[PDB]
Design a binder for these strands. Structure first.
Ligand SMILES: [Mg+2]
Lengths: 75, 75
DNA sequence: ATATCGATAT
DNA sequence: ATATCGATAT
DNA sequence: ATATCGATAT
DNA sequence: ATATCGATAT
């Protein structure tokens, strides 16, 4: 086998949603990576635990994917 | 210890020099990652075999770094 | 360490 | 797999 | 890309 | 066994 992909954190899932939002608001634009990161991170800082929760549940699931795949990985 | 950093390819070393060039030509601009990557890769394609050679020697050395460090890595 | 945002190369 | 280009969070 | 590994065909 | 191809993992 191959080395399993690293764990995707709750923030990593959240960044994907930021990019979705951004695409709808600016369907044309190239992403300014530096500004985009700063904006997502400022938005995440102000989110409540409720809004966060769905991203935490994605992360819990990927933590499970990762633990499962690592069982069989032989380096 | 920690996992050694992955091998830096001849191109990865080149992209650092592209950014240097770019900063001198456009000190004020934020990097458009998508466009930067496309321009770096066009430049790499047309760069002379002599110029490329120096990046290939950095990569050879980093390969040696990596092989040495991996001897003592325990996952 | 490794991942996201894009594109790319080794 | 892993790295670059920037900033960031887990 | 590339180094390495396995299956196949000889 | 060995030469080759081409998948696999990096
Ligand atoms: Mg990485």
């Amino acid at each position: 086998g191959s080395k399993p992909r690293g764990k995707m954190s709750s923030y990593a899932f959240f960044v994907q949603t930021c990019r979705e939002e951004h695409k709808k608001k600016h369907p044309d634009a190239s992403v300014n990576f530096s500004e985009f990161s700063k904006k997502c991170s400022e938005r995440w800082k102000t989110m409540s635990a409720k809004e966060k929760g769905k991203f935490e549940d994605m992360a819990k699931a990927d933590k499970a994917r990762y633990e499962r795949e690592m069982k069989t990985y032989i380096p």
